[PDB]
Design a binder for this molecule. Structure first.
Ligand SMILES: O=C(O)C(=O)Cc1ccc(O)cc1
Length: 361
């Protein structure tokens, strides 16, 4: 509980296994965040969790008892993120989630969330469906809490907008085949299919549906928004509709948009190192986590020094009072009950034409 010069940020991300497509750009983006805030050096401890809730628990606990982190960030996908948020809330350490999660009362005090809440992304997808004469919808998503969040949104927001769910299928993150589920979707013959998945796994139902002769519209979530989806899906990605944060298109934003400068900053640096169109949803989240810390840390430093519980508490209170935090993915304002803090400025709609993401206006 004693004072340190450095600010210690423990980061657990998924750089191996099925979800490496999400964690790798999150870790890469750390090369472009602030190295010092308010005079204090940032010390980052970056760990791999392989996407596994047990490993992510182990890492978050290390951050509490060994590293004595001031802030914890992660994970890259929903199940390990639930695990990190549980640890951070029990231990009373500020936590920035890099994947969506169900923020229950038990998780709300110490966690805020960078990715867009599912219903914000669902709204744009369902409004495109309605505009395009889609009535019946089939669903295929993970058999875990991320897949549940999306299907829940489809049932609640989707149906309230006139849509009819005619089929629900699930698969597991490591599965290499979705043959059985795809055969059921083709048999139900919905007007459109929504896929609830992420990274390279989102390309699995994409290719499988096209291969089995489904020609209807396919809709993807913001978990699929990087170059990896197109690389794996290939031709089967053409004409896909996909929710995404504004970081995929800073060039297209108004000069006035608060998200423009941060998006241009991150993408200029990221894509200079990693090549044209290497921008991703996921790189946006870890970069934005540091945009938030640039705002809240100098405030916290007014009442306490790094390495103390008083500092963690001052960070938590600053997240409530520092408003309109400009970032690459949106403009953040959190409250005691709103831990995502985002509005209409945090979403766009993409499609794919000739292997490139294209904005849908
Ligand atoms: O796979 C999961 O459970 C995820 O949560 C993936 C994900 C990661 C980042 C996003 O901005 C949206 C979705």
């Amino acid at each position: 509980n004693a004072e340190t010069n450095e600010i210690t940020v423990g980061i657990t991300v998924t750089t191996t296994g099925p979800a490496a497509a999400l964690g790798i750009p999150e870790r890469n983006a750390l090369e472009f965040v602030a190295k010092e805030i308010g005079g204090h050096p940032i010390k980052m401890i970056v760990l791999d969790d392989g996407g596994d809730p047990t490993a992510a628990t182990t890492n978050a606990r290390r951050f509490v008892t060994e590293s004595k982190a001031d802030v914890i960030m992660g994970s890259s996908v929903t199940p390990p993120t639930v695990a990190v948020s549980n640890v951070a809330n029990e231990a009373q350490v500020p936590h920035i989630a890099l994947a969506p999660l169900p923020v229950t009362p038990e998780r709300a005090k110490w966690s805020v969330v960078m990715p867009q809440p599912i219903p914000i992304m669902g709204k744009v997808l369902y409004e495109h469906m309605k505009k395009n004469n889609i009535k019946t919808v089939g669903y295929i998503g993970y058999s875990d809490s991320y897949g549940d969040l999306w299907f829940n949104d489809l049932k609640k927001q989707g149906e309230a907008m006139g849509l009819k769910i005619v089929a629900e299928e699930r698969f597991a993150r490591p599965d290499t085949s979705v043959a059985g589920q795809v055969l059921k979707l083709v048999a139900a013959n919905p007007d459109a299919i929504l896929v609830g998945a992420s990274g390279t796994a989102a390309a699995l139902p994409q290719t499988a549906l096209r291969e089995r002769g489904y020609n209807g519209l396919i809709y993807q979530t913001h978990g699929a928004a990087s170059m990896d989806f197109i690389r794996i899906a290939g031709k089967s990605a053409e004409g896909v509709l996909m929710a995404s944060g504004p970081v995929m298109d800073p060039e297209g934003q108004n000069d006035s948009a608060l998200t423009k400068k941060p998006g241009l900053e991150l993408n200029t640096a990221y894509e200079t190192k990693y090549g044209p169109n290497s921008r991703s949803q996921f790189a946006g989240h870890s970069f934005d986590a540091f945009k938030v810390l640039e705002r809240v840390i100098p405030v916290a430093l007014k009442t306490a020094k790094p390495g103390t519980q008083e500092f963690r508490e001052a960070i938590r209170k600053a997240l409530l009072t520092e408003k309109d935090i400009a970032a690459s993915q949106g403009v953040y304002s959190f409250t005691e009950t709103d831990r995502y803090g985002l509005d209409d400025r945090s979403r766009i709609l993409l499609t794919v034409k000739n292997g490139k993401y294209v904005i849908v206006k």
